[PDB]
Amino acid sequence: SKMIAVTMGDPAGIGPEIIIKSLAEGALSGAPVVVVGCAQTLRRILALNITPRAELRIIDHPAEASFSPATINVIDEPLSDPQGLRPGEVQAQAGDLAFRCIRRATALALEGAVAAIATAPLNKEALHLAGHAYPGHTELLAHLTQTTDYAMVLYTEKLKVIHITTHISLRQFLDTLNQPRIETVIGVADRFLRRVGYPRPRIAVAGVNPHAGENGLFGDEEIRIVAPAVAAMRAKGVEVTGPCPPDTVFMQCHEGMYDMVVAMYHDQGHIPLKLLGFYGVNITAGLPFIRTSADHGTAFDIAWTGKAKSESMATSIELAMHIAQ
Amino acid sequence: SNAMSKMIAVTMGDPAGIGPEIIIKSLAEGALSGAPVVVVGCAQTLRRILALNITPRAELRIIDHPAEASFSPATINVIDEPLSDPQGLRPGEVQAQAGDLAFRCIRRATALALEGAVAAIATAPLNKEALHLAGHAYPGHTELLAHLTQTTDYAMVLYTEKLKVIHITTHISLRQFLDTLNQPRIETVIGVADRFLRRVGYPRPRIAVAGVNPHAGENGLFGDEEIRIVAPAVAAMRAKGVEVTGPCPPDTVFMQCHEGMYDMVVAMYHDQGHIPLKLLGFYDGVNITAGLPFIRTSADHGTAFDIAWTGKAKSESMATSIELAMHIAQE
Ligand SMILES: [Cl-]
Ligand code: NI
Ligand code: NI
Predict the structure, then answer these.
(1) How open is the CA angle A92-A8-A93, to the nearest 5 degrees?
(2) Domain that residue B75 falls in
(3) Beta bridge pairs of residue A7
(4) How far apart are CA B106 and CA B148, in angstroms?
(5) How remote is the C-alpha of A29 from its chain's centroid?
(6) Closest to A162 in 3D by CA, of A36, A53, A262
(7) Is the bond into A243 cis (omega within 30 degrees of 0)?
(8) In chain A, which residues have their Cβ closer than 8 Å to the Cβ of B280?
(9) How far is Cα of residue A99 from the mean position of the Cα atoms in its chain?
(10) What is the rounded CA–CA span in Å between residue A283 and residue A320?
(11) Interface check A169 vs B, CB under 8 A
């Protein structure tokens, strides 16, 4: 039984309650999931009657987990002051816990004690206040695993995408586009797909401009940057093609012509995925293990009220499990 | 005529291209057999195509005016706009007489649409080089139609029952889109969208405007086009009573429209609007040139001189464009 670790995230946010909701009932009840988090915090949430009931089984190591419906196995990573934590506020002890849970889960994944991680949201202000000077999970995970090259993947059965960049302006994407990064991401895609079991991954690389530039009629990015990256990776034995017209390449992948598309920018890849009804499926590819997450924040405005939806947390756990098993 | 609806015109386009054969295939059989469609084109060219046995059979009914049409299955009503030398025309070659015909059919059909004799035009493709060689200095249909109807403000619409999109920009580089994005154009396109949908019969169209940057900028974290250009356009049009909202995150706005939250999305650039439509299966690129005084449609195919007059060109997109023109024309 391949296990998933789930990190608590910021305990003052919605992470604790969406973890309990995800694991206490429904499809993931009794699933092989180990929570790395503050057990006392989980108990405070349970006492507020804002989630289904659950028994906690505290453990020291994933190999000591015992899975059953309505029980949550927890490796306790304690807050310094669990009873003093205030809901929905930026607190150093909360940012510190978010960091420590990621650190501990990462160590377990690197040892092979768990197969993958699914992360609950952290608050970057609190993370920084606690002395952890990372923009977010991605840079922290990269540091803890000595991973230089990584990229965001959206993963569904029929359409998979990996992104050259994500949360930057469209203009910045154009002004930073570069051949080394595209080659790197093609390589990350190939290794990622091999590791999920595709012996000979078929990868398509999207162009930048309409019609992939129509032979230079629109822009020069395809001839000067994208096509040379494709050629270099084809020479290195990757089954990669492109540049491909953006408005047909995702369609082609969805129809089974390719296993994954390399999208040039956030919306190029996100628009098609979310239209197909995937509004929990993001993977940080390139790390030594699979890491999933949801696109939502800590939601301090509603934290500890039971209003936050747990579906994206559950979807991220399900995805990690699916790939691991 | 014996139409039970408004009629539309179909223009032949460049006769040396695939226009003639895809018109015949569209109208001679299948869904549009007997439909209230009048072809404006060179009848002798259609007869040359029929004699090549590269299409289904069809009887031609030549007429002088749409009101004199008589619609029936496997018959095509044609207002004959003749080539200067129909028997000398060569398939799949740039020829002045072909460009001249393409122009004349558009001119004649436009006059009929403006007079109300037909309610829309669906165009077959023309060849720009031939159009220019015939002394008609236009990049293509859109500019020619805009000129003949004195239309300044227009935009490309993709139309399905669940997802409709109108474009700020289309065939330009992403960099040129970013360098030329301006508030007046966005206001104009919102206006074109509102008028188009009200005409269709949506008294209070719900229009969403897509952002430029991821998360529509995320309150400025990922760029400022939304704050400086797009949001002011939306506010200006809301002040004119348009039910317009945005800027919206690009990766959720098309999905929301598709789910029924909005009637139409204003897309900022070509791929932003084209990726979602082609993913849902609409790969033919049928589109409406919105803002003209009448409905005009077309498919995204060219003249395909490589296969012209061989019967290999697919007619499905032509048929879909005729069907869409006919449908939208009924409002
Ligand atoms: Cl109308
Ligand atoms: Ni995002
Ligand atoms: Ni196009």
Answers:
(1) 15
(2) 1-331
(3) A36, A119
(4) 9
(5) 22
(6) A262
(7) yes
(8) 275
(9) 16
(10) 9
(11) yes
State the burial class of residue B179 (Cβ atoms within 10 Å of its Cβ: 0-12, 13-18, 19+).
Answer: exposed
Q: List the one residue out of A40, A9, A272 whose CA is nearest residue A154.
A: A272
Helices (H), chain B: 19-28, 43-51, 96-115, 128-133, 141-149, 174-180, 183-200, 225, 231-238, 250-259, 270-279, 316-329
What angle, 0 to 180 degrees and rounded to 10, lies between the N-to-C axes of helices B231-238 and B183-200? 40
Q: What's the rounded Cα separation, in Å, for the pair B176 and B133?
A: 29
Q: What is the DSSP string of A184-247?
A: HHHHHHHHHHHHTT-SS-EEEEE-SSGGGGTTTTS-SHIIIIIHHHHHHHHHTT-EEEEEE-HH
Place of tokens 């789910």: B259
Question: Rounded distance, CA B112 to CA B119, Å?
Answer: 9
Characterise B260 by phi-psi region: left (phi > 0), alpha (psi -120 to 50), beta (else). Answer: left
Dihedral of alpha carbons B212, B213, B215, B221, sign: negative
Classify A99 as helix, strand or coil: helix
Total residue count of chain A as it appears in this document: 325
Max alpha carbon distance in chain B (Å)? 65
Number of compact structural domains in chain B? 1
Residues 123-152 of B with CB under 8 A from A: none
B280–A170 C-beta distance less than 8 A:
no
B175 in contact with A, Cβ within 8 Å: yes
In this structure, are residues B250 and B210 in contact, taking their beta carbons and an 8 Å threshold? yes
- Work out the widest C-alpha separation in chain A, in whole angstroms: 64
Structure-derived torsion over alpha carbons of residues A159, A164, A168, A172, reported in degrees to the nearest 10: -130
- β-strand partners of A289: none
State the method.
X-ray
Give the best residue of B173, B254, B277 to mutate against chain A (max A CB count within 10 A).
Answer: B173
What are B164's strand-pairing partners? Answer: B159
Among B85, B91, B104, which residue's Cα sits nearest to residue B51? Answer: B91
Residue with tokens 């936050």: A308
Task: State the CATH number of the domain containing residue B299.
Answer: 3.40.718.10
**Neighbour tally for B281: CB within 10 Å:** 11
Which contacts qualify for A51-56: CB closer than 8 Å, 24 or more apart?
A51/A17, A51/A20, A51/A21, A51/A24, A51/A306, A52/A20, A52/A21, A52/A24, A52/A25, A53/A24, A54/A20, A54/A23, A54/A24
Distance CA B90, CA B309 (A): 10
Residues B317, B284: contact at Cβ < 8 Å? yes
Distance (angstroms) between ligand 2 centre and the Cα of A161 equals 13
SS3 assignment, position A38: coil
Separation of alpha carbons A41 and A17, rounded Å: 10
Q: Round to the nearest angstrom and report the end-to-end CA distance of chain B.
A: 19
What is the helix (H) or strand (E) element at residue B297, kind and residue range?
A: strand B295-298
CA angle, B300 as apex, B84 and B263 as ends, to 5°?
130
Let me know: does A294 contact B273? Beta carbons within 8 Å: no
Interface contact A110, partner B, CB < 8 A: no
Residue of A218, A251, A276 lying closest to B171 (CB–CB) = A218
Q: B155 is written with which tokens?
A: 């935009």
Residue A170 contacts B where some CB pair is shorter than 8 Å: yes
